[PDB]
Amino acid sequence: VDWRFFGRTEPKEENKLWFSDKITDAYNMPQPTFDFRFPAGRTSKEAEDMMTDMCVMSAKIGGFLPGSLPQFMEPGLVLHLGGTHRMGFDEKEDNCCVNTDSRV
Amino acid sequence: NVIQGQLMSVSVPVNTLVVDTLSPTSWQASTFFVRNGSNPEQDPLRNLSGQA
Amino acid sequence: IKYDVVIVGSGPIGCTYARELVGAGYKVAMFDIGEIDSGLKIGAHKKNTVEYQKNIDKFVNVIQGQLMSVSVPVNTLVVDTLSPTSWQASTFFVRNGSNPEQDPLRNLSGQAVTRVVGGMSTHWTCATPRFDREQRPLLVKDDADADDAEWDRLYTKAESYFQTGTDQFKESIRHNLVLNKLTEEYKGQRDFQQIPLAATRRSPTFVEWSSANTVFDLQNRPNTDAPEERFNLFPAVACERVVRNALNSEIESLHIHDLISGDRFEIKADVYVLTAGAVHNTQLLVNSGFGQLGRPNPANPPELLPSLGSYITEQSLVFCQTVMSTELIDSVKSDMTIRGTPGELTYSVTYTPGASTNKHPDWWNEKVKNHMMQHQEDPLPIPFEDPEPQVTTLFQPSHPWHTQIHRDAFSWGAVQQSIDSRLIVDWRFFGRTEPKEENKLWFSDKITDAYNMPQPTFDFRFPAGRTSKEAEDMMTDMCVMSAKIGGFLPGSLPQFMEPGLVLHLGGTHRMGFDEKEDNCCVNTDSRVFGFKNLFLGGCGNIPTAYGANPTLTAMSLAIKSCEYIKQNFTPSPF
Amino acid sequence: MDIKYDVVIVGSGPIGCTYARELVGAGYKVAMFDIGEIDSGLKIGAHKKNTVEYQKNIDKFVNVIQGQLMSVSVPVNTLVVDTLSPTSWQASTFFVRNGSNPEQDPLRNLSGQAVTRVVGGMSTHWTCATPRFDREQRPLLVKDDADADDAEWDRLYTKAESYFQTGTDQFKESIRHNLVLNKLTEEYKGQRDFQQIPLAATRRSPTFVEWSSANTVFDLQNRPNTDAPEERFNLFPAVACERVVRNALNSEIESLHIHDLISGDRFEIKADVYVLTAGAVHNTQLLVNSGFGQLGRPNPANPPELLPSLGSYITEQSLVFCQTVMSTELIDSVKSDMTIRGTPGELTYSVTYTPGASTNKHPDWWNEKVKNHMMQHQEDPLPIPFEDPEPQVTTLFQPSHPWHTQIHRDAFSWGAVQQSIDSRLIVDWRFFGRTEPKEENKLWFSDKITDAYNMPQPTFDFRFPAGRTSKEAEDMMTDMCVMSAKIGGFLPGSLPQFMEPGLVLHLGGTHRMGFDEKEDNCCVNTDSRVFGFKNLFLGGCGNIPTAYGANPTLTAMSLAIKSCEYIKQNFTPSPFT
Ligand SMILES: *Cc1cc2c(cc1C)nc1c(=O)[nH]c(=O)nc-1n2C[C@H](O)[C@H](O)[C@H](O)COP(=O)(O)OP(=O)(O)OCC1O[C@@H](n2cnc3c(N)ncnc32)[C@H](O)[C@@H]1O
Ligand SMILES: *Cc1cc2c(cc1C)nc1c(=O)[nH]c(=O)nc-1n2C[C@H](O)[C@H](O)[C@H](O)COP(=O)(O)OP(=O)(O)OC[C@H]1O[C@@H](n2cnc3c(N)ncnc32)[C@H](O)[C@@H]1O
């Protein structure tokens, strides 16, 4: 049996997806660059509580499979990225790019 | 394998693994230069390396 | 030549009998199949070199290099990319020392033995906890306070022989950092303290770890320091059999094979003591007509010691490593005022001594201050020479496992070497296993080992029931507890270790009041039933399910055994 | 411990022991310091492999080796670990941690280079291979007189061989040894010679070999003692030697500065003669820590006053390695003289040969071992006895094959899937290339970073020089592929490869020998005396100035014997008082 627990990550100004002005990707477009850490505070603390939780819960069904021990996965493998062009009611106040009709 | 065959990594930093068992006749780097599509903009310690 | 007492094995339990019986005036001979290997102090801890304590991870290699596997099943790995010119067999034939008797699925594949003078005490981690009663064999029936009093008498003497203490890591920041966070997290539910360690600190960067040498220096006697004592140690001697009289009431000699000269002799003594390890005592005994040689066969019970080799117990072992939480690291420097920026002529880091707002004592803040000022290039507040954490919460009914929160010699994956070792903490939780008849160590009537003795074979599973539920519960508890200190280190994720890797095997020649009723081989004097003059010492004697490191308990039993010996055998005149 | 000795020797390896043997035996009052400790049994400095238990479990010995090889220079680690828990403390940079050396260019390193600190040095674990260098690998000891040079080296090697108990016959009756020897001999008949690797070892019984060591050379016992009542020698383990003090004139060493690691005290020690045998890396360190050469990143705009050649022109061998799995043809030939009737196990299996038959391919001693094995072990599919010793084969360095070779079995740690293969089938191949001495190839010491013993941190600036060295390295590899194919195919997981640079542990020329300091870009003369100094001598593979492929210690040893002969003629033992 597989076990995957997915956490929530606090939206933080400093967590960024930006694009190079000299380096280009395979399609000759600006190369995506990440500046990212899981925020300290709740996100971190819930992250580790989530791990403990998977350990406690999974033990109820069986012991871990050797080779597939409880672990954090590579940041981003989960492909659940959001907030890069995020929705909000007001541009400035809700620090956002599209309104609730997703219109820029 | 189907999955892995259409996940193209978004941002791979420059690679600093030491390969020091090349044959002495083989062309060898002097530096960790920008190779094989890597992103020199990218801090390997502040990435989403698995993003694809 | 005729001795008063011969002892087989020079590990810490044989050295117990030596120290007890040499000191009481007996003419003692001691035989080890291994050789003198630790410098001039015979049988001493190998890790007592300046070079190892400056390079402590290196020590793993010393351990690995004197751990010889007991029973390796025949190998069935498929290599099908040899060149077609290369010789290849058509079967997985018996090769490379492997045991064809061994069921690969009912083994203790991590079980191993050490053949050097001082035995495994030349490499052990020196952890010496007492068993609480739940774990402990009874030495007095129906009188618990008397039992307690006897066990404390014996444990206390054993601790003086090993130099156990709980004070050697008192001034470690990592140790106190980890010890106080766990003391707080479990306020009112569990107690934590230092792992009791057989060792004496000689300086802030050097611990003199104990060993068999600590118990007894193994020098020949008489000598200038002990001119009235008589002891000879003979290394490179395989002891092979004890010879029984026809009535099976007395041992008549010890058959040895001197590996240097190649000669074979029969040594005579009044008292024969076997302290060759929980595996090898059992082997010598079976090779001597005790228990049953060969694949066990119930419809043909043995004359003597029908319980030998049965009811063996090995601990479940879980392990991980953690990388210290940001919070705890910052807490190391909570009492610090931090001016300017590291590296510039301005940077100050200060504290005020004895301030009551201060979370940590002066001695700790001072060390932190100086490390922070002297290594402004270093992003961490723990000093580089800061000794390792050594923390435990001892076995209790509500948490029936022993625990070590600490640092052992470890061989780092080099991806793991990316992580600074001041942040890494080892977690080892040790389970107790129910003694069950079907769990067995037996010896082949056909296959033999590197010394030509009957080959050891395990038939072992962790019993169903409590043993298994606790082992799983134990792993969960390590995940829950460790989480409070930091998250797991990649490459050292929570796991069960290879059965027997823990090396805490017992009950191979188990003790009890009554042979039949308690399914056992020796009584509470470690005297083999029926026999006047044969004693077994070692973890093989322990008949219970136990989580804590067994050696000190073995040592306590050995001490009592010597009391019987002293009360029943006259030393020869010198 | 006295104020003052005739001779102090830093280092208790096989080279330091050569000076002790010579000088102690000549009546000098000698002190030997070693930073490491006695840990090899009651024979002080002996080979750790000489235990019954290691020669019954010989692959376990690889852990003893690994246990006492401490890496010389580890660059700063830049592996990315990004699966830490978010709560765990995580680096912002690749900071200097776990003793790594921020001076070190990871791409110009000898990352395999390692040092050993125990009494006896690396001679407590070495492989005991002791070949002579032929002229083309050998430093000149006599200029313009090739005959005299040859005779002086023969004299010297011969004496060393006897100090080491070198021989070429301790595996003469190994089936596997001869199997491989003969195959190769036939394969290269008229092109190359094969013989047993010369090995510093005495065979005591068919299952046990007494490997030589520093202890063979000199037993490291304190003297005076019953067996040597008129000699004077004292060994002081656990003593970090840190500096030799130069006089103001740079003509004489005035004391040796030590640090008792056990008490923690620093002391100065006096002697007439000072001998540094700390190994190729630590001889240089001590010298630099003493003001020879140039502490710090090298800086050509700043040449040093003393020994400008120290820690320059260093050499280290290319090492290529694989293992083979013996060919079916060869395995079969093992039993080619056997007559085989019946089927193994049944009551009528017969395996027989005819002693002395002319049509026999193998000698009697060989066939008799084969027959007994096959008859006593019918469940075994192989003809090689269980206790057959290991092969120990070489074709020595020649101009048309300018590498050393070892076709043998060395302690090895087996991966899972290689343990699947009967070890009787396995042969190691190691070919060793010679490296041209180049000024840019440096061992230097940092002026900021310090090692575990608070000495200046070694730092390599090394590349295998383009030209002959590289060509030969690659040629060597091919020659191993080609030669090895004749015995067997490659063992998966031990495929032909170059080994990590310096793992070979044959570093030379760090303090190299020559006739003239400036003209030969060297630090010591042919008496191994440091130029300018009356009383400072160096011994070790660091003295070797040439490009060599064979294992060096015999050669270092021969140089130290010559050195001792100069000391015997120019210094005088104190009266035995
Ligand atoms: C490790 C290894 C060595 C080998 C080899 C196999 C292995 C795995 N087998 C070899 C063989 O087959 N052929 C041979 O020629 N070489 C082999 N080697 C290398 C050989 O082992 C060395 O070449 C040889 O020891 C060199 O001898 P040495 O010049 O005596 O140097 P060694 O390092 O043995 O002893 C020096 C020592 O002095 C100490 N030390 C270091 N620094 C200090 C200071 N500062 N103060 C006091 N003592 C100091 C050491 O602790 C050491 O014993
Ligand atoms: C290896 C090890 C062990 C260990 C440990 C960690 C490591 C990796 N740390 C421990 C800890 O923290 N504390 C705890 O209590 N135990 C720990 N251990 C286990 C401990 O070392 C052993 O319990 C203890 O050493 C057992 O002592 P004992 O004296 O009974 O046995 P020994 O150490 O194995 O020595 C016995 C010897 O007898 C020899 N021998 C064997 N067969 C023969 C024959 N046939 N003839 C003559 N001699 C024989 C051995 O060579 C040996 O010396």
Ligand SMILES: OC[C@H]1O[C@@H](O)[C@H](F)[C@@H](O)[C@@H]1O
């Ligand atoms: O590998 C991560 C992925 O794994 C699956 O378990 C989930 F369905 C997804 O949400 C996710 O993209």
Ligand SMILES: OC[C@H]1O[C@@H](O)[C@H](F)[C@@H](O)[C@@H]1O
């Ligand atoms: O590797 C298992 C060993 O590890 C240690 O941490 C314990 F102290 C020992 O009791 C044990 O024998």
Ligand SMILES: OC[C@H]1O[C@@H](O)[C@H](F)[C@@H](O)[C@@H]1O
């Ligand atoms: O692994 C390198 C080593 O291997 C052996 O085969 C050698 F003989 C040595 O010259 C060398 O130290």
